[PDB]
Write a protein that holds these residues in place. Structure first.
Motif, PDB file in Angstrom:
ATOM      1  N   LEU A  34       0.826  -1.192   0.000  1.00 21.96           N
ATOM      2  CA  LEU A  34       0.000   0.000   0.000  1.00 21.96           C
ATOM      3  C   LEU A  34       0.867   1.252   0.000  1.00 21.96           C
ATOM      4  O   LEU A  34       1.935   1.276   0.608  1.00 21.96           O
ATOM      5  CB  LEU A  34      -0.895   0.019   1.237  1.00 21.96           C
ATOM      6  CG  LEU A  34      -1.929  -1.088   1.414  1.00 21.96           C
ATOM      7  CD1 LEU A  34      -2.517  -0.990   2.807  1.00 21.96           C
ATOM      8  CD2 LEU A  34      -3.016  -0.964   0.362  1.00 21.96           C
ATOM      9  N   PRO A  36       1.697   5.007   1.162  1.00 17.32           N
ATOM     10  CA  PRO A  36       1.414   5.693   2.420  1.00 17.32           C
ATOM     11  C   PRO A  36      -0.021   6.186   2.541  1.00 17.32           C
ATOM     12  O   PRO A  36      -0.664   5.993   3.569  1.00 17.32           O
ATOM     13  CB  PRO A  36       2.429   6.816   2.415  1.00 17.32           C
ATOM     14  CG  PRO A  36       3.630   6.117   1.836  1.00 17.32           C
ATOM     15  CD  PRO A  36       3.046   5.339   0.674  1.00 17.32           C
ATOM     16  N   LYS A  37      -0.525   6.806   1.483  1.00 21.76           N
ATOM     17  CA  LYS A  37      -1.890   7.317   1.496  1.00 21.76           C
ATOM     18  C   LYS A  37      -2.835   6.234   1.997  1.00 21.76           C
ATOM     19  O   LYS A  37      -3.678   6.473   2.868  1.00 21.76           O
ATOM     20  CB  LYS A  37      -2.307   7.765   0.089  1.00 21.76           C
ATOM     21  CG  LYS A  37      -3.670   8.452   0.036  1.00 21.76           C
ATOM     22  CD  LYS A  37      -3.904   9.146  -1.303  1.00 21.76           C
ATOM     23  CE  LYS A  37      -5.167  10.004  -1.259  1.00 21.76           C
ATOM     24  NZ  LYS A  37      -5.406  10.743  -2.534  1.00 21.76           N
ATOM     25  N   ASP A  38      -2.678   5.036   1.444  1.00 23.39           N
ATOM     26  CA  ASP A  38      -3.507   3.908   1.824  1.00 23.39           C
ATOM     27  C   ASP A  38      -3.224   3.487   3.257  1.00 23.39           C
ATOM     28  O   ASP A  38      -4.135   3.450   4.079  1.00 23.39           O
ATOM     29  CB  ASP A  38      -3.273   2.743   0.868  1.00 23.39           C
ATOM     30  CG  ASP A  38      -3.713   3.063  -0.552  1.00 23.39           C
ATOM     31  OD1 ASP A  38      -4.811   3.653  -0.716  1.00 23.39           O
ATOM     32  OD2 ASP A  38      -2.969   2.718  -1.497  1.00 23.39           O
ATOM     33  N   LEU A  40      -2.210   4.987   5.709  1.00 27.10           N
ATOM     34  CA  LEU A  40      -2.853   5.926   6.611  1.00 27.10           C
ATOM     35  C   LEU A  40      -4.338   5.643   6.745  1.00 27.10           C
ATOM     36  O   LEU A  40      -4.904   5.751   7.830  1.00 27.10           O
ATOM     37  CB  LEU A  40      -2.643   7.360   6.132  1.00 27.10           C
ATOM     38  CG  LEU A  40      -1.197   7.835   6.013  1.00 27.10           C
ATOM     39  CD1 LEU A  40      -1.202   9.340   5.856  1.00 27.10           C
ATOM     40  CD2 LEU A  40      -0.398   7.446   7.244  1.00 27.10           C
ATOM     41  N   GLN A  41      -4.976   5.292   5.639  1.00 25.99           N
ATOM     42  CA  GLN A  41      -6.396   4.989   5.678  1.00 25.99           C
ATOM     43  C   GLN A  41      -6.597   3.670   6.393  1.00 25.99           C
ATOM     44  O   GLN A  41      -7.449   3.549   7.274  1.00 25.99           O
ATOM     45  CB  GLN A  41      -6.958   4.910   4.261  1.00 25.99           C
ATOM     46  CG  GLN A  41      -7.112   6.267   3.621  1.00 25.99           C
ATOM     47  CD  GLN A  41      -7.915   7.212   4.496  1.00 25.99           C
ATOM     48  OE1 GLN A  41      -7.470   7.606   5.575  1.00 25.99           O
ATOM     49  NE2 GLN A  41      -9.109   7.571   4.043  1.00 25.99           N
ATOM     50  N   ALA A  42      -5.790   2.687   6.009  1.00 27.38           N
ATOM     51  CA  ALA A  42      -5.846   1.361   6.600  1.00 27.38           C
ATOM     52  C   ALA A  42      -5.653   1.470   8.102  1.00 27.38           C
ATOM     53  O   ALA A  42      -6.209   0.688   8.866  1.00 27.38           O
ATOM     54  CB  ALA A  42      -4.761   0.486   5.998  1.00 27.38           C
ATOM     55  N   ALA A  43      -4.872   2.455   8.520  1.00 22.56           N
ATOM     56  CA  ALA A  43      -4.591   2.658   9.933  1.00 22.56           C
ATOM     57  C   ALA A  43      -5.801   3.175  10.706  1.00 22.56           C
ATOM     58  O   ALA A  43      -5.885   3.014  11.922  1.00 22.56           O
ATOM     59  CB  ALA A  43      -3.408   3.617  10.098  1.00 22.56           C
ATOM     60  N   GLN A  44      -6.739   3.797  10.008  1.00 21.82           N
ATOM     61  CA  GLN A  44      -7.921   4.321  10.673  1.00 21.82           C
ATOM     62  C   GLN A  44      -8.990   3.240  10.678  1.00 21.82           C
ATOM     63  O   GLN A  44     -10.073   3.408  11.234  1.00 21.82           O
ATOM     64  CB  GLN A  44      -8.432   5.555   9.938  1.00 21.82           C
ATOM     65  CG  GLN A  44      -7.451   6.701   9.875  1.00 21.82           C
ATOM     66  CD  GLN A  44      -7.973   7.827   9.020  1.00 21.82           C
ATOM     67  OE1 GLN A  44      -9.091   8.301   9.219  1.00 21.82           O
ATOM     68  NE2 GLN A  44      -7.170   8.261   8.057  1.00 21.82           N
ATOM     69  N   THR A  45      -8.662   2.121  10.047  1.00 23.21           N
ATOM     70  CA  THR A  45      -9.570   0.993   9.956  1.00 23.21           C
ATOM     71  C   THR A  45     -10.020   0.491  11.327  1.00 23.21           C
ATOM     72  O   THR A  45     -11.187   0.631  11.702  1.00 23.21           O
ATOM     73  CB  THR A  45      -8.901  -0.148   9.170  1.00 23.21           C
ATOM     74  OG1 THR A  45      -9.058   0.089   7.766  1.00 23.21           O
ATOM     75  CG2 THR A  45      -9.503  -1.479   9.523  1.00 23.21           C
ATOM     76  N   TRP A  49      -5.555  -2.981  12.729  1.00 24.77           N
ATOM     77  CA  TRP A  49      -4.935  -2.471  11.515  1.00 24.77           C
ATOM     78  C   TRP A  49      -3.988  -1.341  11.844  1.00 24.77           C
ATOM     79  O   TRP A  49      -2.818  -1.368  11.461  1.00 24.77           O
ATOM     80  CB  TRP A  49      -6.003  -1.991  10.544  1.00 24.77           C
ATOM     81  CG  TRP A  49      -6.551  -3.098   9.739  1.00 24.77           C
ATOM     82  CD1 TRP A  49      -7.027  -4.286  10.203  1.00 24.77           C
ATOM     83  CD2 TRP A  49      -6.694  -3.134   8.320  1.00 24.77           C
ATOM     84  NE1 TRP A  49      -7.460  -5.064   9.162  1.00 24.77           N
ATOM     85  CE2 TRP A  49      -7.270  -4.380   7.988  1.00 24.77           C
ATOM     86  CE3 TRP A  49      -6.393  -2.234   7.291  1.00 24.77           C
ATOM     87  CZ2 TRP A  49      -7.553  -4.753   6.672  1.00 24.77           C
ATOM     88  CZ3 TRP A  49      -6.674  -2.603   5.979  1.00 24.77           C
ATOM     89  CH2 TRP A  49      -7.250  -3.854   5.683  1.00 24.77           C
ATOM     90  N   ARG A  50      -4.501  -0.349  12.557  1.00 23.43           N
ATOM     91  CA  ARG A  50      -3.686   0.778  12.953  1.00 23.43           C
ATOM     92  C   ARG A  50      -2.326   0.258  13.413  1.00 23.43           C
ATOM     93  O   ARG A  50      -1.290   0.609  12.849  1.00 23.43           O
ATOM     94  CB  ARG A  50      -4.360   1.541  14.090  1.00 23.43           C
ATOM     95  CG  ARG A  50      -3.654   2.825  14.420  1.00 23.43           C
ATOM     96  CD  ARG A  50      -4.297   3.561  15.559  1.00 23.43           C
ATOM     97  NE  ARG A  50      -3.468   4.703  15.920  1.00 23.43           N
ATOM     98  CZ  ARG A  50      -3.525   5.328  17.088  1.00 23.43           C
ATOM     99  NH1 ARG A  50      -4.379   4.921  18.014  1.00 23.43           N
ATOM    100  NH2 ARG A  50      -2.720   6.354  17.334  1.00 23.43           N
ATOM    101  N   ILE A  91       4.705  11.446   7.776  1.00 21.19           N
ATOM    102  CA  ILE A  91       3.594  12.367   7.848  1.00 21.19           C
ATOM    103  C   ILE A  91       4.154  13.763   7.908  1.00 21.19           C
ATOM    104  O   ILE A  91       3.687  14.643   7.198  1.00 21.19           O
ATOM    105  CB  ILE A  91       2.731  12.120   9.090  1.00 21.19           C
ATOM    106  CG1 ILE A  91       2.105  10.725   9.017  1.00 21.19           C
ATOM    107  CG2 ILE A  91       1.648  13.181   9.182  1.00 21.19           C
ATOM    108  CD1 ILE A  91       1.376  10.323  10.281  1.00 21.19           C
TER     109      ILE A  91
END
Lengths: 441, 134
Positions: A34, A36-38, A40-45, A49-50, A91
Motif C-alpha cells: 500500500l 502511504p496514502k492507503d 494511513l487509511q488502513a490505519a484508521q480501519t 490495523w492501525r 507524515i
C-alpha cells in the motif's frame, strides 16, 4: 517486535477481517504493497490495523521512498500506542509538503535588513540565513528567530556572491575580494585577495571556494588557509557563474564560453562553445555542466567530453536562476518563465507559466522532488508542482511586486522559505521573508 | 522429471519438479530433506491444487489477477499457502491483491471490504484520523 508488543498491550482481539487473521508478518507483507496514502487509511480501519499500519520498518522504507532517511522522534495519553518514528517522519513530510502546497501562509518572519539595498545573494544553511547585499555587508540571520545574528561588515564593495557551509560564510564583493567569515562570530577570518575585478560568483565545495570575477579569472581559495590555491585564467569576458564539485571548476563568463577547469593544474580542461551570448547561470552535477546563457538557451554539457549534450532552448530570455538535481534542471528565466528539464533526455519536462505564471522575470528558484519555488520581479514567490508543472500558489506576494517590489533570491529548506525581498525604489524595504512550512508534531 | 507432494488433506500431488520447486519449501524438502512425498501440513489439497495451478503457470500479472479472483478465504489461504510454500511469486500476487482491496482510501470502505468493526473509542478514532490526516 514493537508491532507484537502493541498487540499484547492494546488487545485489539477478535477481528473478522482478512488481514487481522494473517500472520502479523504477512499482514505486513500485504500492507507494504500500500502507498502511504492507503496505509494511513488502513490505519484508521481498526485498532488492529492501525497497529499494523504502524510497523516502523514499514515506513523506514515508505520514507526512503519520499527520501526521508531520518525518522522523526516526537516527544502520554491513555491506551498507549507505539508510533513509528518513520510513519510520523513520513507524515511530517507529507504535512510539510502540504503546508507548502496548500498550507496557509503564516505571515513570514520579516527580516528587515540591508535598508535601501539589494540582497545580492542568499545562503540558507539550516536555521542560519546569510543575506549578501550590495551594501558591502552580509547578514547572518536565524531562519528560526529571524533575528539578525551578525552583519559581516568588512567588504568595501557591495557583496555579490556568497557561499556558506555552517559557520563558514564566504562572500565575494565588487571590492575585488572574497572574504571567509565565521557565521557565528561574524568575524572575517580571511580576505581573499587575488581578484582585481568584482567577485561576482563563487562556488564553495568543502574547504575550497572557486570564485568567479569580472576579471575573467576564477580563483580557487582554501576557505581554511585563506590561500588562493589556483587561478583559472582563460575567460575573455567576466565570469558570471562558477561551479566547483571539488574535482572540476565549471565556469560561465560573459564571454559566451563555459570553461571547465581542473583547478589543481589551473588548466582549462574544457572550453564549452555553444552560447551565442553571455552565460549567466551554471549548474554542474560533476557529470553534466548546465550553462544558462543570455543567449536564451541552456546548454547541457558533458564535463568529460566537453561535448554539448543538449541545447535546451525554450526560454525567451536570460536564464537567471537554474538548479540542477538528479539530471532534472529547473531554469529561472527573465522571460518570467521557469522551466523544468530532464537534462538526460533534454526534454523540457515542464514550463512554469499559466495564468499564475510570473509577471516579470524569474529571479530565483528552488525545487525539490515535489515543488519548484520561484521568486520573481513580480514580488511573488510561487510554489509549483515540479511533477505536474502546475502553479500551486504564491508562497509570497509582495503587495508591491508590481510597484517595484521584487523577490531577488530565495532559498528553501525542506521546511521554510527565505526570500530576499526589496526594490530599487523605496516600495519594498529590502528584507528577507522567512516563511515557515514546518508542522506541529 | 516430476515429484509427488502430499497436501495436509493427505492428497498426493504428482507435480513436475521445477514446477513445484517454485516453492522453495517444497524445493528444500525435495533437494535437501528429500521427502518421497513432500508433506505440506500447512497446505490442503484444495489450496495446494491452487498453488500448483498458479505455479504450473510459471504489477499484478494479466492472469494471476483472474486466478486470484477467488474469494477472500482462498486468497488468505494462498497467502499462507504461498508463505508456507515460500513462493515469493504467489505470495506477492495474492498479498498485493489484498492490498489492492485496501488501495482505495476511506477507512469505512476498507472495512466494508474486510468487515472490520470500528473498535475506536470517541476520542480514539478522532486521534487516529488526526494522525493519519492527508
Amino acid at each position: 517486535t514493537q508491532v507484537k508488543h502493541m498487540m499484547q498491550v492494546i488487545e485489539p482481539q477478535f477481528q473478522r477481517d482478512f488481514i487481522s487473521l494473517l500472520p502479523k508478518e504477512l499482514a505486513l507483507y500485504v500492507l507494504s504493497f500500500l502507498e502511504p496514502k492507503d496505509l494511513l487509511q488502513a490505519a484508521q480501519t481498526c485498532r488492529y490495523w492501525r497497529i499494523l499500519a504502524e510497523d516502523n520498518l514499514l515506513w523506514r522504507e515508505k520514507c526512503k521512498e519520499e527520501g526521508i532517511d531520518e525518522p522523526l522522534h516526537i516527544k502520554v495519553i491513555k491506551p498507549g500506542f507505539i508510533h513509528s518514528p518513520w510513519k510520523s517522519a513520513y507524515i511530517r513530510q507529507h504535512r510539510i509538503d502540504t503546508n507548502w502546497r496548500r498550507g496557509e501562509l503564516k505571515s513570514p518572519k520579516v527580516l528587515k535588513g540591508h535598508d535601501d539595498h539589494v540582497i545580492t545573494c542568499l545562503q540558507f544553511c539550516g536555521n542560519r540565513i546569510v543575506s549578501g547585499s550590495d551594501d558591502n555587508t552580509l547578514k547572518v540571520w536565524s531562519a528560526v528567530t529571524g533575528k539578525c545574528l551578525r552583519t559581516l561588515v568588512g567588504h568595501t564593495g557591495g557583496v555579490w556572491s556568497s557561499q556558506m557551509r555552517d559557520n563558514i560564510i564566504i562572500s565575494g564583493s565588487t571590492d575585488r575580494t572574497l572574504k571567509v567569515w565565521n557565521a557565528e562570530t561574524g568575524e572575517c577570518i580571511h580576505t581573499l585577495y587575488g581578484h582585481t575585478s568584482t567577485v561576482r560568483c563563487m562556488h564553495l565545495h568543502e574547504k575550497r571556494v572557486v570564485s568567479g570575477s569580472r576579471d575573467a579569472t576564477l580563483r580557487v581559495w582554501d576557505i581554511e588557509t585563506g590561500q588562493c590555491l589556483h587561478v583559472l585564467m582563460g575567460h575573455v569576458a567576466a565570469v558570471r557563474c562558477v561551479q566547483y564539485d571539488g574535482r572540476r571548476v565549471v565556469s560561465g563568463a560573459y564571454d559566451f564560453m563555459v570553461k571547465v577547469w581542473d583547478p589543481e593544474t589551473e588548466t582549462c580542461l574544457h572550453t564549452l562553445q555553444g552560447h551565442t551570448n553571455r552565460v549567466y547561470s551554471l549548474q554542474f552535477d560533476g557529470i553534466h555542466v548546465v550553462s544558462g546563457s543570455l543567449d536564451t538557451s541552456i546548454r547541457v554539457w558533458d564535463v568529460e567530453t566537453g561535448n554539448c549534450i543538449h541545447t535546451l532552448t525554450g526560454h525567451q530570455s536570460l536564464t537567471s536562476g537554474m538548479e540542477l538535481k538528479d539530471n532534472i534542471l529547473v531554469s529561472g528565466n527573465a522571460d518570467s518563465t521557469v522551466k523544468i528539464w530532464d537534462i538526460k533526455t533534454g526534454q523540457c519536462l515542464q514550463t512554469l507559466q499559466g495564468p499564475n505564471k510570473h509577471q516579470s522575470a524569474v529571479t530565483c528558484l528552488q525545487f525539490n522532488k515535489n515543488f519548484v519555488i520561484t521568486s520573481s520581479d513580480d514580488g511573488t514567490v510561487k510554489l509549483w508542482d515540479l511533477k505536474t508543472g502546475e502553479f500551486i500558489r504564491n508562497l509570497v506576494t509582495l503587495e508591491s511586486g508590481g510597484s517595484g517590489g521584487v523577490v531577488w533570491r530565495i532559498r528553501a529548506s525542506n521546511t521554510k522559505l527565505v526570500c530576499a525581498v526589496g526594490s530599487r525604489n523605496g516600495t519594498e524595504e529590502t528584507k528577507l521573508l522567512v516563511l515557515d512550512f514546518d508542522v506541529d508534531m | 522429471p516430476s515429484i509427488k507432494l502430499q497436501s495436509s488433506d493427505g492428497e498426493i500431488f504428482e507435480v513436475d519438479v521445477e514446477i513445484a520447486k517454485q516453492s522453495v519449501t517444497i524445493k528444500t524438502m525435495l533437494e535437501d530433506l528429500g521427502m518421497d512425498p513432500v508433506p505440506l501440513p500447512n497446505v490442503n489439497a484444495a489450496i495446494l491444487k491452487k498453488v500448483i495451478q498458479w505455479c504450473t503457470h510459471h504489477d499484478i500479472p494479466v492472469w494471476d489477477q483472474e486466478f486470484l479472483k477467488v474469494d477472500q478465504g482462498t486468497l488468505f489461504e494462498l497467502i499462507l499457502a504461498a508463505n508456507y510454500l515460500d513462493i515469493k511469486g504467489l505470495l506477492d500476487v495474492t498479498c498485493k491483491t489484498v492490498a489492492n482491496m485496501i488501495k482505495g482510501k476511506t477507512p469505512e470502505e476498507i472495512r466494508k471490504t474486510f468487515n472490520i468493526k470500528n473498535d475506536f473509542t470517541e476520542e480514539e478514532e478522532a486521534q487516529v484520523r488526526k494522525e493519519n490526516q492527508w
